[PDB]
Design a protein around this ligand. Structure first.
Ligand SMILES: [Cl-]
Ligand SMILES: [Cl-]
Ligand SMILES: [Cl-]
Ligand SMILES: [Cl-]
Ligand SMILES: [Cl-]
Ligand SMILES: [Cl-]
Ligand SMILES: [Cl-]
Ligand SMILES: [Zn+2]
Length: 111
């Protein structure tokens, strides 16, 4: 079984640690980004062919980091998401570098 897998829940496609959680409709799990979420059939969460929500930016970057990417390649990745203060400060709780380093990584406030 792979260590990390994707699962849509609460409006985004999150990543979870399969050594920590088993996914099931109506059961909460906590994603790599730290949000505790519950897959719901009404949101299309239990049919992966119907997963139309956008990827969770925090989980996507957390997964790249967990997989050992250098900061420069993680930075290229992050550039394709929109980063609100909620998301940026959530990513800073996951990464171990300085908050300024997180903000620079996201490319979120740079033209
Ligand atoms: Cl298992
Ligand atoms: Cl592993
Ligand atoms: Cl949980
Ligand atoms: Cl939820
Ligand atoms: Cl809803
Ligand atoms: Cl579903
Ligand atoms: Cl986005
Ligand atoms: Zn997430």
């Amino acid at each position: 079984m792979q260590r990390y897998l994707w699962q849509q829940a609460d409006g985004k496609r999150h990543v979870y640690d399969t050594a920590r959680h088993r996914v099931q409709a109506g059961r909460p799990f906590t994603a790599l980004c730290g949000e505790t979420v519950t897959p719901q059939t009404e949101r299309g969460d239990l049919t992966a062919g119907l997963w139309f929500d956008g990827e969770c930016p925090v989980c996507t970057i957390a997964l790249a980091k967990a997989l050992g990417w250098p900061m420069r390649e993680i930075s290229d990745l992050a550039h394709r998401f929109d980063w609100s203060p909620a998301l940026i400060t959530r990513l800073a709780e996951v990464l171990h570098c300085s908050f300024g380093e997180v903000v620079e990584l996201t490319g979120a406030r740079m033209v």
